[PDB]
């Protein structure tokens, strides 16, 4: 069993001016074909090195199975995220869960944006959902590590602030990009992604 | 005393066509400007949380401290590491050394760039001074990380993969920028560092 | 500000049986006095650092920084947080918080059980106060990475799982340290640092 | 494969006095038999990981991977570099490359002690081969982070600066452990991975 890459749920230009078209291309159709394909390269090595029983084989293959399979796994979120007919706030029960644990809807974008612009480096940053206390949660992950598979908390929101995701267009400025992508983000997918988390 | 940014010792588009003008004024006059003042803010704050013996404080300050000093030390470097005048091989001890640690220039250069495409995520690729066993050394650093205060290995030539460091021209393609900038390496700069090690 | 090794608020054998009177006394007399007089040492080397303008000697102290200054931090909590009148549960306002935050006081400490067990390597386990959440929290910390000065809660107890914490008495058997130390837990003290978290 | 506890090449009282026998059969039987269990059972969480192509749980089982794995990849090696007819110094080509890359054999033991030592938290220091360079080289690695799979440098002789390696006898005192184990290096067994690296 292969991992694929997913194509995009919108045209390349869906989501101007917020993000521009030859952003979203070579983020999809360069850095992520790149994340697919390198993950199915580490995850075939990682299996001879299981069967042989080599462990300093799986050991040297773990840098590349966390930041390529943490690239498929946020990247793939990602695109789902956004959409053309995404901004404004979430209704229903995610509303509901955003003012009950963050105040307000836009104290909880003053908390996102401030995780996100708050990473040094490369990275993501998250809304999630913790199972274990019931609700929500924003953390900063570095690099591509997974939301889930470092922190458990369930993915709902992620930005992506690696400098490919915006430096074309806003440059150095990442508050910029920051604010922008706010009238793209897809609350219906969060909301969807949110409502699985509750049974 | 404040640190202080230092002027570029060449024009914007000194180093075209491998680096062009437009990354090389963002890369000084934004990236660095940033990290010099960050740099300074939190110097000032570090003293005050040492002054009350804050250790929390002091703690809490180490991100900030590392990544904006860490990139003021790395750049500063940097723009020496490079020139108009560049390019070709270095001549003299220099090479003698390369030649003796390395076997030959060319295996020197694949060295470094391995190292440095092999950064996952940000960082830097470095040539460097062993102090301690009196030969040359290669080593990869992640984020800003510099390479003297986390090794202990005396900088003599940074190559610098954050992406804001090549996206523009070069977009994802990382080995294309690794290939351009060999042709503006100041073996002067890379030389003098080296003499300044033995003694 | 020269730090002290702070007086322990009881005698080495105040604990026993469950964590005996060598590792009290080698805990405090050798340990964290060796953080202290590290941290001190450190100190003092970043005032001359910073009056020098090397950010190259900030960055390789900050190592011993986090390390000492952390375990002094994190240290001179733990003390207050055991006592020989402990055990037992905690009452009013805080023993509210942990049945509302963790479903009972049985499930709580299965929780910080499960993450001070779950360290691996040296470091602590913590229940803290989340201000900004205004709620309980369990995190874990790697090495002496404080609690406040990593992760911004608020340390209200800790619990140390180097193995020196516990390896003369349990030997390999942390979960056996776990569950003998609730017999110590000050919870007139954790109550203390509870109700100073809120206004 | 199913990893098996190797057995020691001695009995567990063979190093006294310099490691005494309670340590040695802790550190055998107790410490390795659990990096041993909890290696296996994360390789078949590993491979149902890999049939599913879940990359969240491939990436969550990445600590106890390299703990456990790392534990037994180092362990493994540690009592062959360890022997009652031990101590001393090795001979022949081994001892002119010490001399050669270190200065001396008593330069060498500081250096290796230094780094030992150095370990702040649970770790390793190690004596290595470097194969591109072709020359010894000397590192330390953080909990159980093995030499070849993290820094590609070939295991020649390893240090367990774990507490639980020394701690029963030599308390926090690690530079009288260090001293000690000296005289119980198996340095016909250094020799012949040292032999082995080269062609
Ligand atoms: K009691
Ligand atoms: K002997
Ligand atoms: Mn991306
Ligand atoms: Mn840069
Ligand atoms: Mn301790
Ligand atoms: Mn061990």
Chains 1, 2, 3, 4 share one sequence.
Request: net charge neutral; aromatic share 10%.
């Amino acid at each position: 069993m292969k991992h694929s890459l997913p194509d995009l749920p919108y045209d390349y230009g869906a989501l101007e001016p917020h993000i521009n078209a030859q952003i979203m291309q070579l983020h999809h159709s360069k850095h992520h074909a790149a994340y697919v394909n390198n993950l199915n390269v580490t995850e075939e090595k990682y299996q001879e090195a299981l069967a042989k029983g080599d462990v300093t084989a799986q050991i040297a293959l773990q840098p590349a199975l966390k930041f390529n399979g943490g690239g498929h796994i946020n990247h793939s979120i990602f695109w789902t995220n956004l959409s053309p007919n995404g901004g404004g706030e979430p209704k229903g029960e995610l509303l509901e869960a955003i003012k009950r644990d963050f105040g307000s809807f836009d104290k909880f974008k003053e908390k996102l944006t401030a995780a996100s612009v708050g990473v040094q480096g490369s990275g993501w940053g998250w809304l999630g959902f913790n199972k274990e206390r019931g609700h929500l949660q924003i953390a900063a992950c570095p690099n591509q590590d997974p939301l889930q598979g470092t922190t458990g908390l369930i993915p709902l929101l992620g930005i992506d602030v690696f400098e490919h995701a915006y430096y074309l267009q806003y440059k150095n400025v990442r508050p910029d990009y920051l604010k922008a992508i706010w009238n793209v983000i897809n609350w219906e997918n969060v909301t969807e992604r949110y409502m699985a988390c509750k049974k």
